[PDB]
Design a protein around this ligand. Structure first.
Ligand SMILES: [Zn+2]
Lengths: 273, 99, 253, 194, 48, 89, 193, 301, 40, 49, 294, 19, 48, 49, 82
């Protein structure tokens, strides 16, 4: 009749308050009140800590587990390494057959901006920014023209699309690539435009429709978390089919799924499915 | 365990069911599709844990629905599906006794 | 579960209600004489798991005399190796002063109680002919000396299982097993009403007033397609009538 | 009436004279008195079964272990509702109960004699019991006005024949007993009537 | 994370490319660990 | 408690470095933790998500649902009249 | 006949669309959207019920007064909208992603991978399971030995009338057995020859 | 009539085969030579056909006439037997009904109205006219095609027949110890999908319990479909409905084809002391919510 | 908590019957073409 | 094992061991509605053997 | 598993090809299930036992199970003076040694399992090969519409073998009954009683004494003759399938044919690899006259 | 209620119901 | 399952199945050639 | 009827195994008995001992 | 078993359910929209574990099965060896 997991079967010195059953000794009414308050505070803190541990996400749990696993009793100091093993390697490209040259990151000084690009990829044509001609005409936006160029290329059954290069457009392309609606994308470090390789399935196109949220840059739309969750809720059934792009206050272009997951609301960009 | 669902065949009364009065009999009820209904106390013999509450957060489509519109304009006789009634008799009966 | 020396040696594990802390015993004597199981007091704090449902480790924590010499704490879950159903208990925790459980070098002399036995399949061993029937305490309603055959004959047993021709064979109770995928395929399920689990699968019969004209038209002009509501009825000009529980993926017919 | 618990002589409609009658709504119709039958006997049996289950399921009024008072009340319900096989199975499960093994609940002679009286009164699925009575017009089919319509020795012969048929169907052949095998019919007591 | 292992995934075929032209495609310890992770992830993918 | 709530705010070894110990080293207090919970707490236990469950098959056939009588199923059509019958039930 | 030639069908695993689909057949704008119940005009709702949809809503040209409005347009617009519907499985395949509702099929694979620990992972240390026919063996025997080979272990005349087992099918047969076959074969064309 | 025809097999006298027929049947039955005649049938089949013909030839009418028993006597005996039937007999009768009549009720057609009437008709001349017309219809088509009994001929999954499934696999070996036989071991016998093999295992366990005349484990289907039971409970909690979740009411989400890697590495690098710890039936339950969703069905636990 | 009830869905069309699939399509119920190795 | 199995079978169907059986219905159970959790299964032999 | 499945598929394919008989799919999978349960029981026995691995002389000791479950670790205090990475690598090496010992034991036990499986499968092979109508042809023989031609290929070196005697009624049952008669004669011999009273006789009667086992004891109660199931004379599943439905018969025939073709392809590729390793076969096809000339 | 078991369904002896 | 099996049973002909369990068999001329012996369910005609 | 019979006959009469070229009779690339080459070989060889 | 000599002159009609109805040339109500637009209260199958003082579904099924077997002569003689 042996047991496991407990080296001492029982504690001779360790007893119980109820087992002792000694006469209750109270210092005073103030002491009783202080004891009640401190024990209820301890219980509340324990409950809150337990709830937080339950609510801790998987990423945090795995990071904490790895940290404690690799923990050392001594805080080891960093060592000197080679001149560089931490540089961000440039993405591969073919110099001969290319839409644009993959300009390396060491020329960040030479790089310009979307409005005033520097002279590069002169062998190719340059995408001119859309500009309204009259007041009545809608104020076009890079998101709008990117969406319409992608839609037109999809309808005309094209492979590569040259689209304007902004942070929001690159984030939208990255999200579409993550969701698989786009075969791939590449941000050649050209100030004006980058490349997107489309995807087709069963002769038709895997992208059904793309629509920018706002036609004018003058009007700006904000998406509340409830308005985002209404998209997920489809007459009582969870639905992640249609994809919505939002840009938050942290300059992080995400999708409505992650926006709902972290309970944040950013400005909308486009709807694609 | 399935709770007692509201807006059912037996829960709803006659006017809410068909906008007409039917006799409320414990037996011989062809309309309610039952033979004999001897009625004990609702939750006496049944186990307590089997009683899980009730649910009424929906719309009774026969009784009340959103956007009550006419199904088809012509003929004018037909109306929304919420109204299912039989033809009204003419000169039903008269009572000689004053009362 | 093994028999040696005339008693049942069972190995099990006792775990907290949230199944965080667990202590497994390799051998325990199944003793029906004890009303409820007894555990050492030292295990109280080694099984106290302050979960969220229970702010304290145990829902019930009181003191009893078996003078207030033991602690009743629980609930605590218990998994017997030979049992497929967990048993939840409120065992006695006894200090060393009232009772020393250690007997040999590493043996705690833990004996399982009647409350734990009656909740698992070992209760069947308390019936006549069981292993614990000989160790049941003296009572006028049980005589351990007499044999199982004698007890069953007293209760009414005359012959063995289904020896008489009148009683049917026990193995003839179920001659067939109904698995849809192994014969005739799945079922053609329909409904009339709001929801598939709300309406009924019975389509209205051929006697409906809205269907009689269509049925008559079909009977007259059987060689054409007649428009109407009669197609919704269970009567169809095709030999396969639309009735509940019809196998439509079956090879034949 | 099993439905309304009203006497048949004084009342004809269920729920007459009762303030809290659930069988009479505001614009409903009176329900005629129901006559006793095996359907209502089984209704009462099922109500008793539900009560027995709740007696241990209820955490407020229920007891951790059943009571001999509850057991004898259930036996009284069964005998008064004339549930023969149900009472037999209840008695067997009472014998097999854990509380019976512990001896907390004991089987008293009043329960034993009530069970015996129920068994005698209720008709038997195969044989005949004290409840069965001799009938007059059955002579048209039997031929004997006094003797009971069942021969125990013929029933024994048919039982042996059916046993041999079962053996033949089970094995495919039959094993012939030796020529010295004589059928035993010493204890076959003829049906003696009152 | 260091943009040394690159991946192109079709409907069913996954190609993994090592891109270390500065070191003549030489793998460090961290690079080799990441490459092993990518290899045993792409091989153990359902539609691979 | 979401982002709309007001913000919570923010050489050697610090004070919280001393209590942290490598799990390889034996624990200070040998609490008999369940092995399954130990694996599950660090995100290493094989996760049996509900999505891995497929259809719940019907083991035994429930019963035969016979055609129950209704106002639209009568041998004679005389009792199905606009003055008497407005629907099956 | 034209309807049966142009007949179509939809995937009913979803019982209704999961995304708004907007089309126009002959200028009539038709929108089909997910809904709790079948909410639409009587004719298009009956068309959807015939299609088997249970959670859908169809709208043509907004308010009914809006032109064009004709029964042919009403039928063809809703049929075009239903035809232009993409199923969830098809959308998932086009995106190249595994649906949430089909990953239960991998559970036996994962279970077997987890249960391959220990002895189940072992293989015969020395045998690869493939064996080559290095030598050629024959067990054919002459007819005289075939007749008497199985006198003891089996019954006498084990190869009695077997056509494939014996070189001579009728070898070892008796008069009645030969006569049955010959009589059948000769009395089938009794009056012919 | 039932006793003297269906029962009382001692006086049944079938045809006695000659010596040559006995020799040939012995050869064919003991060892089958290829291309042999398959028309020959076993004596059990002959007896079953005899009983079937005896049932079929029964026709009601006047007792003094050629008809053995009348419809009144038939219904009286049937009603009295049905009243006398207890729960066990009623269960066996329901099993027989589901085996025999229920598929016939499902597959019956109005074209067989006259045959269905002739099943227990009162023998008019109209039935004779209908039989002559049915003979004409048979001449038009095929008799064995146009009859009720042969409608249910072919079934899917011919490899695993219910006749073979009636006998549980390693029944005694796993009955001695249920702990040593998790469902994986028994399911290794079959080559079907997971749901099908689990259904087969549940059916085999229930058949074994019924044969042994012991209480079957009603929680065994729960333990085999523990993931399915939890999924259904949580689906009923999320969607305000009661029943079994179906495909049309399931969430739509698209994961990457390599989404399973995180769980796959855990499963591939998991290690266990014993094998019962590896294959315990409660490994699906981790938190108190899981335990509640699993054990919320029975009140005792 | 998804107050939209799955139990109360659809409209009663009177006596118009419609099929509802249990788990999957009857067309993909059986896969003999791969189980019995009938594929090219 | 034989006597354990006999006891289980007798407590399941006591009518099967009678020469002339009586009516057999199902009555109440002393172990609640889930007494199969304690009465189910064939008798079990020891794991050491 | 893999090897056992290959063997069973080869057995089924050969059984269908040589004698035109069909094995039930249930019977096919039953053998694999028996092998799996045998491995399961071996694992059940092995998890009880324990293995020890040692690293750095005796500085590091790891106590595990043959499956590889960590149970105990004992480490000399001097090892803790080493850095964490070195300690991790030492523990990993000790666990690797323990895994190596467990692998040795498990592979020996699995060879035992393989021998048991071959012994169980013996009756089927002997019944499909030991019948008077069974023959094969050399693989290098040209096959045509009518029959197989025979190339020379050193026909003097080539020798056809026969595994069945022309003597009447020679069977494993006859061999086993001869063995039983011989052992009974030895027991009844005058030295037999002395040998039976000797410890050797006691051990022999304890092991091969099934008729002496009391009722209720595990194991067979008698020694029975081996299985005699000849393929060309016993109907297995083909007649039942043909009588029931033709589609299932055709499907099972197709499955058997595909399995036989697959095992033949496996044998051909193994022979090709052996030839390439020997050096008699080139790495790329050079002789197209043996493929395209048909 | 026992009259229906001894009558021809088509035959109605007195549809009027008046003597 | 983009392209499922369907009804791969040849125990009866396509025309036989159409006759047994379909309305389309009674109107051979209306059904086109490509859908001749394919349908297995009764159809309702609604004339708009 | 003709299509069904032809399909059944072809399915029953199809061969299997490995031929003189060591490939399956229905191999994707190579073929066997092209233009009755084996037929004319058997015609010009025969079976005469 | 109680028995008395009685004769049931008219047995009845087979309860198959597929019988040719009495045909009407003119329908009383010419509107077909009522059938398509009819609605009724929901039929909840199970409410509170489905407990009744008398079993409804089981007893109704048994009573249906009794006369179904009576008209199908216990389903014996129809089937044969397959
Ligand atoms: Zn009353």
């Amino acid at each position: 009749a042996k047991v496991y997991g407990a080296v001492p079967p029982l504690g001779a010195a360790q007893g119980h308050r109820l087992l002792h059953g000694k006469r209750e000794r109270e210092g005073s009414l103030f002491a009783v009140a202080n004891d009640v308050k401190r024990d209820e505070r301890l219980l509340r803190q324990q409950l809150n800590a337990l709830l937080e541990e339950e609510r801790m996400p998987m990423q945090a749990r795995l990071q904490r587990n790895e940290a404690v696993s690799s923990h050392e009793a001594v805080p080891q100091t960093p060592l000197v390494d080679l001149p560089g093993v931490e540089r961000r390697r440039d993405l591969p490209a073919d110099p001969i057959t290319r839409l644009f040259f993959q300009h390396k990151g060491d020329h960040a000084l030479y790089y310009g901006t979307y409005d005033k690009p520097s002279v590069q990829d002169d062998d190719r044509v340059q995408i001119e920014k859309r500009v309204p001609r009259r007041r009545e005409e809608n104020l076009y936006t890079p998101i709008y023209d990117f969406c319409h160029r992608i839609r037109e290329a999809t309808e005309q059954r094209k492979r590569f699309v040259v689209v304007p290069s902004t942070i929001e457009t690159r984030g939208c392309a990255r999200v579409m690539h993550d969701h698989g609606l786009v075969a791939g994308f590449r941000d050649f470090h050209n100030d004006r435009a980058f490349a997107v390789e489309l995807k087709y399935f069963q002769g038709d196109s895997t992208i059904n429709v793309i629509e920018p949220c706002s036609y004018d840059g003058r009007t700006e739309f904000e998406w509340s978390p409830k308005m985002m969750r209404r998209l997920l809720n489809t007459h009582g059934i969870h639905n992640r089919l249609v994809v919505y792009i939002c840009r938050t206050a942290d300059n992080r272009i995400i999708d409505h799924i992650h926006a709902v997951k972290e309970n944040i609301g950013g400005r909308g960009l486009m709807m694609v499915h | 365990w399935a709770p007692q669902m509201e807006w059912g065949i037996e829960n709803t009364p006659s006017q809410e069911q068909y906008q007409e009065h039917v006799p409320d009999t414990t037996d011989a009820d062809f309309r309610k599709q039952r033979r004999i209904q001897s009625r004990p106390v609702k939750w006496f013999y049944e186990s307590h844990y089997t009683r899980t509450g009730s649910f009424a957060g929906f719309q009774p489509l026969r009784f009340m629905q959103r956007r009550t519109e006419r199904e088809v304009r012509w003929p004018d006789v037909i109306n929304a599906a919420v109204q299912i009634q039989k033809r009204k008799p003419a000169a039903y009966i008269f009572k000689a006794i004053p009362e | 579960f093994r028999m040696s020396g005339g008693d049942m040696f069972v190995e099990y594990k006792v775990l907290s209600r949230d199944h965080r802390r667990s202590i497994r015993v390799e051998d325990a004597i199944v003793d029906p004489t004890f009303k409820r199981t007894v555990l050492p007091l030292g295990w109280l704090e080694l099984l106290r798991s302050p979960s969220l449902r229970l702010p304290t480790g145990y829902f019930v924590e009181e003191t009893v005399h078996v003078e207030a010499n033991a602690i009743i704490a629980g609930p605590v879950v218990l998994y017997i190796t030979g049992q497929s159903v967990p048993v939840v208990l409120n065992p006695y925790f006894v200090p060393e002063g009232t009772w020393d459980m250690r007997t040999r070098d590493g043996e705690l002399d833990l004996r399982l109680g009647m409350d734990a036995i009656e909740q698992c399949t070992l209760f069947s061993e308390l019936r006549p002919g069981g292993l614990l029937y000989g160790k049941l305490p003296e009572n006028p309603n049980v005589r351990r000396n007499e044999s199982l055959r004698a007890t069953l004959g007293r209760y009414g047993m005359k012959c063995d299982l289904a020896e008489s021709p009148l009683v049917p064979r026990p193995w003839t109770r179920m001659r067939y097993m109904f698995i849809d995928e192994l014969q005739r395929g799945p079922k053609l399920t329909e409904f009339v009403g709001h929801n598939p689990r709300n309406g009924t699968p019975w389509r209205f019969s051929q006697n409906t007033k809205y269907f009689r004209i269509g049925i008559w038209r079909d009977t007259i002009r059987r060689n054409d397609m007649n428009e109407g509501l009669h197609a919704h009825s269970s009567w169809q000009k095709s030999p396969q009538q639309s009735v509940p529980e019809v196998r439509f993926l079956a090879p034949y017919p | 009436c099993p439905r309304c618990s009203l006497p048949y002589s004084t009342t004809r409609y269920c729920g007459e004279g009762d303030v809290d009658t659930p069988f009479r709504k505001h614009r409903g119709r009176w329900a005629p008195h129901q006559k006793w039958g095996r359907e209502w006997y089984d209704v009462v049996a099922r109500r008793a079964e539900a009560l027995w289950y709740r007696a241990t399921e209820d955490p407020y009024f229920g007891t951790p272990q059943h009571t001999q008072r509850q057991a004898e009340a259930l036996l009284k319900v069964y005998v008064q509702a004339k549930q023969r096989g149900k009472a037999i199975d209840f008695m067997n499960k009472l014998r097999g109960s854990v509380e019976y093994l512990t001896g907390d609940i004991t089987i008293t002679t009043v329960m034993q004699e009530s069970y015996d009286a129920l068994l005698d009164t209720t008709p038997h699925p195969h044989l005949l019991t004290n409840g069965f009575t001799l009938e007059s017009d059955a002579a048209k089919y039997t031929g004997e006005v006094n003797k009971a319509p069942l021969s125990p020795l013929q029933f024994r012969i048919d039982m042996e024949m059916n046993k041999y048929r079962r053996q033949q169907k089970e094995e495919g052949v039959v094993r012939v007993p030796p020529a010295l095998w004589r059928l035993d019919t010493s204890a076959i007591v003829p049906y003696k009537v009152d | 994370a260091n943009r040394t292992i690159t991946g192109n995934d079709g409907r069913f075929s996954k190609t993994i490319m090592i891109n270390e032209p500065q070191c003549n495609q030489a793998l460090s310890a961290k690079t080799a660990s990441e490459l092993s992770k990518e290899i045993d992830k792409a091989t153990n993918a359902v539609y691979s | 408690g979401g982002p709309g709530s007001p913000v919570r705010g923010p050489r050697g070894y610090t004070a919280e470095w001393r209590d942290l110990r490598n799990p390889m080293r034996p624990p200070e207090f040998p609490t008999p933790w369940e092995r399954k919970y130990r694996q599950y707490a660090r995100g290493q236990h094989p996760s049996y998500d509900m999505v891995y469950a497929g259809p719940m098959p019907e083991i035994f056939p429930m019963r035969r649902d016979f055609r129950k009588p209704t106002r639209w199923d009568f041998h004679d059509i005389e009792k199905q009249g606009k003055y008497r019958t407005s629907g099956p039930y | 006949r034209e309807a049966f030639s142009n007949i179509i069908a939809v995937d009913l695993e979803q019982e209704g669309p999961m995304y708004p689909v907007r089309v126009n057949a002959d200028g009539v704008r038709v929108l089909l959207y997910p809904a709790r119940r079948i909410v639409a005009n009587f004719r298009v709702a009956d068309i959807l019920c015939a299609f088997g949809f249970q959670h859908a809503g169809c709208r043509i040209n907004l308010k009914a007064t809006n032109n064009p409005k004709s029964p042919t347009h009403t039928v063809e617009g809703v049929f075009e909208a239903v035809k232009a519907l993409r199923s969830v499985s098809e959308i998932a395949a086009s995106r190249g992603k595994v649906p949430h509702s089909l990953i239960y099929n991998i559970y036996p694979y994962l279970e077997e991978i987890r249960r391959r620990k220990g002895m189940m992972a072992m293989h015969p240390p020395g045998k690869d399971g493939l064996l080559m026919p290095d030598r050629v063996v024959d067990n054919r025997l002459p007819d005289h030995l075939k007749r008497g080979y199985y006198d003891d272990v089996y019954w006498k005349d084990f190869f009695a009338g077997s056509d494939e087992h014996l070189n001579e099918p009728r070898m070892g047969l008796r008069g009645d057995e030969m006569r049955r076959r010959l009589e059948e074969a000769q009395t089938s064309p009794a009056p012919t020859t | 009539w039932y006793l003297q025809n269906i029962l009382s097999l001692e006086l049944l006298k079938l045809k006695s085969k000659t010596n040559a027929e006995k020799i040939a049947t012995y050869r064919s039955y003991m060892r089958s030579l290829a291309s042999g005649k398959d028309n020959t049938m076993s004596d059990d089949d002959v007896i079953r056909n005899i009983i079937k013909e005896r049932w079929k030839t029964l026709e009601f009418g006047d007792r003094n006439a050629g008809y053995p028993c009348t419809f009144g006597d038939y219904i009286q005996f049937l009603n009295e037997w049905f009243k006398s039937l207890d729960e066990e007999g009623m269960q066996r009768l329901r099993e027989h009904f589901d085996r025999r009549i229920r598929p016939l009720l499902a597959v019956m057609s109005p074209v067989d109205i006259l045959w269905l009437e002739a099943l227990t008709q009162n023998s008019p001349h109209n039935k004779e006219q209908l039989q002559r017309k049915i003979a004409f219809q048979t001449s038009l088509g095929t008799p064995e095609f146009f009859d009720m009994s042969k409608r249910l001929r072919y079934e899917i999954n011919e490899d695993y027949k219910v006749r073979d499934e009636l006998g549980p696999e390693l029944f005694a070996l796993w009955s001695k110890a249920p702990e040593r036989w998790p469902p994986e071991r028994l399911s290794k016998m079959y080559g079907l999908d997971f749901t099908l093999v689990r259904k087969i295992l549940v059916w085999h366990h229930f058949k074994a319990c019924y044969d042994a005349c012991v209480e079957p484990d009603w929680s065994l289907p729960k333990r085999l479909f523990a993931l399915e039971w939890i999924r259904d409970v949580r689906a009923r909690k999320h969607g305000l409905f009661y029943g079994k979740m179906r495909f049309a009411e399931q969430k739509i989400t698209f994961y990457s084809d390599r989404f399973l890697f995180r769980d796959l590495v855990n499963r591939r690098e998991a290690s266990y002391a014993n094998v019962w710890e590896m294959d315990d039936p409660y490994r699906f339950l981790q938190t108190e919510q899981d335990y509640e969703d699993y054990w919320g069905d029975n009140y005792d636990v | 908590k998804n107050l939209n009830s799955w139990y109360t869905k659809g409209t009663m069309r009177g006596g118009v019957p419609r099929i509802y699939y249990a788990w999957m399509r009857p067309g993909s119920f059986t896969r003999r073409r791969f189980e019995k190795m009938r594929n090219p | 094992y034989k006597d354990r199995l006999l006891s289980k079978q007798f407590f399941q169907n006591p009518q099967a061991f009678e020469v002339v059986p009586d009516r057999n219905e199902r009555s109440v159970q002393f172990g609640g509605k889930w007494e199969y959790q304690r009465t189910h299964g064939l008798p079990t032999v020891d794991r050491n053997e | 598993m893999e090897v056992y499945r290959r063997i069973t598929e080869r057995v089924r394919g050969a059984l269908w090809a040589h004698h035109g008989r069909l094995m039930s799919e249930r019977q096919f999978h039953r053998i694999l299930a028996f092998v799996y349960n045998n491995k399961y029981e071996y694992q059940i026995r092995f998890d009880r036992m324990e293995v020890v691995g040692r690293e750095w002389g005796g500085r590091v000791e790891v106590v595990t199970t043959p499956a590889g479950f960590l149970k105990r670790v004992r480490v000399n205090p001097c090892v803790e003076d080493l850095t964490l990475y070195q300690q991790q690598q030492l523990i990993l090496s000790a666990y690797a040694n323990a895994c190596a010992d467990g692998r040795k034991l498990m592979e020996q036990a699995e060879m035992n399992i393989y021998k048991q499986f071959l012994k169980d499968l013996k009756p089927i092979v002997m019944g499909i090969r030991d019948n008077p109508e069974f023959y094969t042809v050399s693989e290098n023989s040209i096959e045509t519409i009518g029959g197989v031609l025979q190339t020379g290929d050193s026909n003097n070196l080539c020798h056809t073998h026969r595994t069945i005697p022309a003597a009447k009624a020679r069977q494993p049952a006859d061999e086993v009954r001869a063995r039983q008669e011989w052992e009974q004669k030895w027991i009844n011999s005058p030295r037999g009683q002395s040998w039976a009273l000797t410890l050797r006789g006691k051990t022999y009667f304890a092991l091969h004494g099934p008729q002496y086992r009391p009722r209720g004891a595990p194991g067979a109660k008698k020694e029975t003759l081996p299985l005699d199931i000849p393929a060309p004379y016993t109907a297995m599943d083909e007649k039942r399938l043909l009588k029931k439905n033709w589609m299932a018969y055709l499907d099972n025939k197709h499955v058997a044919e595909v399995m036989w073709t697959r095992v033949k392809i496996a044998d051909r590729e193994k022979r090709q690899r052996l030839l390439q390793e020997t050096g008699r076969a080139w790495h790329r096809p050079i002789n197209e006259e043996a493929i395209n000339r048909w | 209620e026992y009259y229906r078991w001894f009558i021809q369904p088509g035959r109605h002896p007195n549809p009027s119901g008046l003597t | 399952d983009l392209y499922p099996e369907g009804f791969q049973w040849k125990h009866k002909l396509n025309t036989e199945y159409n006759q047994w369990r379909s309305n389309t068999w009674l109107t051979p001329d209306l059904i086109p050639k490509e859908h001749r012996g394919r349908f297995l369910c009764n159809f309702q005609l609604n004339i708009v | 009827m003709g299509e069904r019979m032809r399909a059944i006959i072809e399915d029953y009469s199809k061969g299997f195994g490995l031929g003189p070229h060591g490939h399956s009779p229905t191999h994707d690339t190579i073929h066997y008995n092209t233009l009755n080459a084996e037929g004319e070989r058997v015609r010009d060889l025969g079976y005469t001992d | 078993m109680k028995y008395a000599d009685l004769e049931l002159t008219t047995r009845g009609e087979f309860p198959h359910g597929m019988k040719e109805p009495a045909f009407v040339k003119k329908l009383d109500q010419n509107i077909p929209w009522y059938f398509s637009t009819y609605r009724s209260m929901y039929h909840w199958p199970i409410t509170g574990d489905n407990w009744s003082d008398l079993n409804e579904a089981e007893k109704h099924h048994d009573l249906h099965m009794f006369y179904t077997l009576a008209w199908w002569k216990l389903g014996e003689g129809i089937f044969g060896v397959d």
